[PDB]
Design a protein around this ligand. Structure first.
Ligand SMILES: CO[C@@H]1[C@@H](O)[C@H](O)O[C@H](CO)[C@H]1O
Ligand SMILES: CO[C@@H]1[C@@H](O)[C@H](O)O[C@H](CO)[C@H]1O
Ligand SMILES: CO[C@@H]1[C@@H](O)[C@H](O)O[C@H](CO)[C@H]1O
Ligand SMILES: CO[C@@H]1[C@@H](O)[C@H](O)O[C@H](CO)[C@H]1O
Ligand SMILES: CO[C@@H]1[C@@H](O)[C@H](O)O[C@H](CO)[C@H]1O
Ligand SMILES: CO[C@@H]1[C@@H](O)[C@H](O)O[C@H](CO)[C@H]1O
Ligand SMILES: CO[C@@H]1[C@@H](O)[C@H](O)O[C@H](CO)[C@H]1O
Ligand SMILES: CO[C@@H]1[C@@H](O)[C@H](O)O[C@H](CO)[C@H]1O
Ligand SMILES: CO[C@@H]1[C@@H](O)[C@H](O)O[C@H](CO)[C@H]1O
Ligand SMILES: CO[C@@H]1[C@@H](O)[C@H](O)O[C@H](CO)[C@H]1O
Ligand SMILES: CO[C@@H]1[C@@H](O)[C@H](O)O[C@H](CO)[C@H]1O
Ligand SMILES: CO[C@@H]1[C@@H](O)[C@H](O)O[C@H](CO)[C@H]1O
Ligand SMILES: CO[C@@H]1[C@@H](O)[C@H](O)O[C@H](CO)[C@H]1O
Ligand SMILES: CO[C@@H]1[C@@H](O)[C@H](O)O[C@H](CO)[C@H]1O
Ligand SMILES: CO[C@@H]1[C@@H](O)[C@H](O)O[C@H](CO)[C@H]1O
Ligand SMILES: CO[C@@H]1[C@@H](O)[C@H](O)O[C@H](CO)[C@H]1O
Ligand SMILES: [Cl-]
Ligand SMILES: [Cl-]
Ligand SMILES: [Cl-]
Ligand SMILES: [Cl-]
Ligand SMILES: [Cl-]
Ligand SMILES: [Cl-]
Ligand SMILES: [Cl-]
Ligand SMILES: [Cl-]
Ligand SMILES: [Cl-]
Ligand SMILES: [Cl-]
Ligand code: NA
Ligand code: NA
Ligand code: NA
Ligand code: NA
Ligand code: NA
Lengths: 345, 345
């Protein structure tokens, strides 16, 4: 009935190679901040309001035409969204996709360019809704994929174009459900991947087309589990990456496809562990990137192929550190005052 | 009425991170070779025949569901294709999309997952045909985008999802034509980007969402020209990257998005020039990667984020060199006997 402390922002590397971050202010409006230039250490816009009143993490996704679209639960518990009217232009007004949802939304593009949104319902089942044509309305009716879930859901596309959703169940195990064909409303049953998880799951597709899931375990270590075959079962056993973490993990790919995991430590600093040598390599010991953070970290690869990590500070500002040739940059402040608006805590 | 010596193969980094190369044998069948493992220096399958009888470069493209599909002109001058029946499964038979074509085919996915194929016609105009639904038949009827072209066409998608095609005109200038909306049959007029080019054009999208075109000039230097604004005009002036090149150029992105160009030199070795520092950086002097090659080079970034370059040798085998920590590997032979089947020479 609880999870590790959430990520405070949603981040994208945009169609013109700029990082753009979305969070919630004390006013419950959605604010965003973007790099001026497509480079590590670019100056930032500063925070501007997209307005709205939200009761979930705001979640940005890039349409297949490059237009950003932000999804959030409203004060009426409906799913709301707001989109760029054109790839490098301004924003629509907030509009309702209706429904009643009880989680952060999770979004992915189908192979046919239709966004599909997953969110928990009042019945704690997983519900979904989709664009009826590529990067466009109108949207379908809501429908349920059943199950009973106790975390925010996470969606990723398989290397064969089939969407797959991950969530914690009532038994605290990791559960998943998948499309049986791309672009379809043909889904599997919910299946258990067992384990005990104490955070939202994080899902990545490896360089070799395998889904891999990360989550905090009952021992507060970082655990992971993967498809053993590209876009296929069987799944591996759960394996520990050790550490003791006091937030949700974030995972991103180095530009050589080496996976790197980030999480807050018992000392409230940012910690990370990475694959060494190659994307098939063994994982490093956990090492500190310092800071004092009051959120999970959010990791993304920028247009220079460097990882950048965002986390809320003790002042509730968003702070930022990034990879250098030598190691990592000192934390700088992007300012703002951000709240954890997660629909599940 | 001629162009710089062509690339001998088409290459992809597949949905499971393996390089796979497609060429034509002395028998005029299409042969392919694939890495066993998703890593620089992986062992190779060796050459196997997809059969057929082709009279163009065979051009592989990845469907949005990860299925490879190969397009080639047949001995009847129709467009033929062959596709994986499933992402990591076997191949269909060769099937005809009809038409009469007089160039290599050029392929891109629309934002809605529909492949669209561009090829010169008997009238030397640019024609096109598309999947009617995402990664699937049936295909549309053929239709013309007019113009008069004297090179193989090259297509790339803009950062706002609009397809754009580049080709040399009868005046030896670079010409282009674009979708006015993603997924549409609404096209601009042909417009000139001026210059004089003596190779096929090569088109890349930069990290910052700008189309950039490379081609050999009348002085046998490598020239380039770019959109100055993401997915928009105006275009820059033509700028020389110098060198004296005896083949078509190949261009790929380093994993930090630094562009790198490859071409055969007057000494018939492989030469390259790269952006230094970042994807916004100045270009290096031309430097040699040795070899004795009888084709243009073909460049691709592998699943370890390293560039790998293929070229035909004096023995008509395909040879291969790749980036190391220090510099580049010695050329190794993948064997085979490959011909230049380009529909335009
Ligand atoms: C995003 O942070 C914003 C800040 O930029 C604004 O000045 O004031 C807001 C609320 O007063 C903050 O929550
Ligand atoms: C997303 O914010 C929306 C707002 O746009 C709407 O007018 O009113 C909703 C509450 O009824 C808010 O949650
Ligand atoms: C302009 O296209 C937008 C689309 O991005 C959004 O999902 O949905 C809107 C309609 O709900 C569309 O009008
Ligand atoms: C994933 O959703 C639920 C799970 O939470 C429940 O414990 O068990 C159900 C079936 O036994 C699952 O479908
Ligand atoms: C990841 O799931 C659980 C973990 O939470 C538990 O602490 O340890 C178990 C094995 O002892 C794991 O399988
Ligand atoms: C059809 O492939 C699915 C796969 O998508 C899922 O991750 O894992 C399933 C087995 O647990 C597979 O059967
Ligand atoms: C990222 O951690 C930052 C730290 O870098 C800064 O000096 O001090 C901040 C608090 O003032 C911390 O939250
Ligand atoms: C091998 O590259 C790793 C990098 O992945 C990590 O972020 O930071 C480490 C310490 O700077 C680096 O050594
Ligand atoms: C791809 O190279 C092939 C070779 O693999 C085959 O043994 O023999 C073919 C023709 O005899 C060659 O062209
Ligand atoms: C692609 O190769 C095709 C072959 O498959 C077809 O039977 O016959 C065609 C000639 O009619 C060949 O060009
Ligand atoms: C299985 O899907 C394939 C598709 O990849 C190809 O373009 O076209 C075929 C029909 O021409 C389709 O059947
Ligand atoms: C690009 O195709 C042709 C060009 O080759 C011709 O010289 O001029 C035509 C129009 O003036 C173009 O449309
Ligand atoms: C790239 O197009 C041409 C080039 O071919 C010529 O040699 O030199 C011209 C300028 O002198 C270029 O604009
Ligand atoms: C609408 O944008 C198009 C652009 O796609 C093309 O590269 O260049 C054109 C100008 O030459 C632009 O008008
Ligand atoms: C790539 O160039 C190769 C060279 O590396 C090899 O030693 O000798 C080959 C000819 O035997 C050349 O074509
Ligand atoms: C900075 O990296 C460049 C690389 O892009 C090029 O392929 O090869 C050069 C020589 O090894 C390298 O120094
Ligand atoms: Cl994008
Ligand atoms: Cl509905
Ligand atoms: Cl990996
Ligand atoms: Cl990028
Ligand atoms: Cl808070
Ligand atoms: Cl792919
Ligand atoms: Cl037809
Ligand atoms: Cl660039
Ligand atoms: Cl890759
Ligand atoms: Cl030949
Ligand atoms: Na990007
Ligand atoms: Na698509
Ligand atoms: Na991923
Ligand atoms: Na790939
Ligand atoms: Na590109």
């Amino acid at each position: 009935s609880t999870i590790a402390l959430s990520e405070i922002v949603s981040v994208v590397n945009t169609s013109d190679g700029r990082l753009e971050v979305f969070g919630v202010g004390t006013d419950k409006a959605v604010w965003h901040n973007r790099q001026m230039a497509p480079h590590t250490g670019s100056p930032w816009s500063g925070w501007s309001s997209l307005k709205g009143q939200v009761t979930s993490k705001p979640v940005v996704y890039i349409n297949t035409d490059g237009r950003l679209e932000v999804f959030a639960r409203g004060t009426d518990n409906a799913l709301w969204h707001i989109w760029q009217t054109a790839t490098n232009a301004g924003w629509s007004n907030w509009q309702s996709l209706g429904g009643v949802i009880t989680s952060n939304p999770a979004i992915y593009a189908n192979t046919d360019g239709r966004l599909e949104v997953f969110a928990r319902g009042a019945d704690n089942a997983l519900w979904h809704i989709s664009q009826t044509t590529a990067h466009s309305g109108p949207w379908s009716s809501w429908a349920s994929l059943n199950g009973v879930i106790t975390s925010n859901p996470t969606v990723h596309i398989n290397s064969d174009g089939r969407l797959e959703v991950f969530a914690r169940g009532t038994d605290n195990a990791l559960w998943h459900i998948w499309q049986t064909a791309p672009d379809s409303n043909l889904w599997s049953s919910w299946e258990s991947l067992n384990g005990i998880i104490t955070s939202d799951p994080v899902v990545i597709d490896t360089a070799d087309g395998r889904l891999e899931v990360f989550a905090r375990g009952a021992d507060n270590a970082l655990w992971h589990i993967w498809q053993t075959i590209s876009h296929s079962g069987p799944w591996s056993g759960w394996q520990s990456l050790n550490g003791v973490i006091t937030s949700a993990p974030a995972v991103a790919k180095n530009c050589d496809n080496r996976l790197e995991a980030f999480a807050r430590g018992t000392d409230n600093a940012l910690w990370h562990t990475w694959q060494t040598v190659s994307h098939s390599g063994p994982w490093s010991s956990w090492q500190s990137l310092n800071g004092v953070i009051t959120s999970a970290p959010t990791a993304v690869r920028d247009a220079d192929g460097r990882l950048e990590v965002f986390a809320r500070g003790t002042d509730n500002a968003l702070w930022l550190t990034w990879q250098t040739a030598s190691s990592w940059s000192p934390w700088i402040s992007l300012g703002g005052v951000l709240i954890d608006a997660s629909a599940i805590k």
